[PDB]
Amino acid sequence: INDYGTHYITSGSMGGIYEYILVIDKAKMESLGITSRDITTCFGGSLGIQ
């Protein structure tokens, strides 16, 4: 079997083969996050007794 093969040819053709593969893939991901917080507190008062 190893000397003469597992199979033999019964028919076919004698042509050529040209196989070209052009594969492309792209993945773009962007994430932007902005958080701003401001707080202000002011309290003042004067008293007068005389």
What does the binding site for other proteins look like in residue numbers (CB under 8 A)?
44, 46, 50
Six-digit token string for 49:
């007794």
Q: Please report how close the Cβ of residue 22 comes to other proteins at its closest, in angstroms.
A: 23
For the CB of residue 30, give the shortest distance to other proteins in the complex, in Å: 9
In angstroms, the CA 8 to CA 1 distance is 11
Q: Closer to other proteins by CB, 5 or 33: give it.
A: 33
The token duo for 41 is: 């507190």
User: From the CB of 23, what's the least distance to other proteins, in Å?
Assistant: 20
